[PDB]
Amino acid sequence: SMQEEDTFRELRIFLRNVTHRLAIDKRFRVFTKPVDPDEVPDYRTVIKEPMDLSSVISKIDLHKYLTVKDYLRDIDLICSNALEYNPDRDPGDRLIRHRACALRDTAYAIIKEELDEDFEQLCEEIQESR
Numbered sequence: 001s002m003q004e005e006d007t008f009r010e011l012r013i014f015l016r017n018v019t020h021r022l023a024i025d026k027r028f029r030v031f032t033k034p035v036d037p038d039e040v041p042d043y044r045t046v047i048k049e050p051m052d053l054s055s056v057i058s059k060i061d062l063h064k065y066l067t068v069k070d071y072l073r074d075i076d077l078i079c080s081n082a083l084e085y086n087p088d089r090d091p092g093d094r095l096i097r098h099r100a101c102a103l104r105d106t107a108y109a110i111i112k113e114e115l116d117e118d119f120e121q122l123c124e125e126i127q128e129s130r
């Protein structure tokens, strides 16, 4: 229905605003673009599904996310990729792990405060019906 397409357009507006607020935070700069194959030629042999905040905005605009749950699966993949690729005790690895955990926790906290649980349940019920 037209009302259902208005629901999904409100979901996209909401996801673009959360994603912009993560992308401007100086802590999260390392997550704003794909890892450069040139600088790190080993990255794509270890990490089988790379993800970054620029790809997330592209995916919103391609209508890839019909629920906030499917968006959070990509935020979780950015964070789990960084924990798996940078697991060592040295300060460089520990700093990127601390930033990855802060990106995940910040996204979840904005969604807990600003997403209406009945808006998310409506998106889930339209998705299930298709």
Ligand SMILES: CC(=O)N1C[C@@H]2C[C@@H]3O[C@]2(Cc2[nH]cnc23)C1
Pocket (backbone or CB within 6 Å): 030, 031, 035, 036, 039, 040, 081, 082, 085, 086, 096
């Ligand atoms: C997001 C992530 O997990 N990354 C690991 C890489 C290792 C290190 O920070 C890089 C990018 C880079 N270029 C040169 N050294 C590096 C980003």
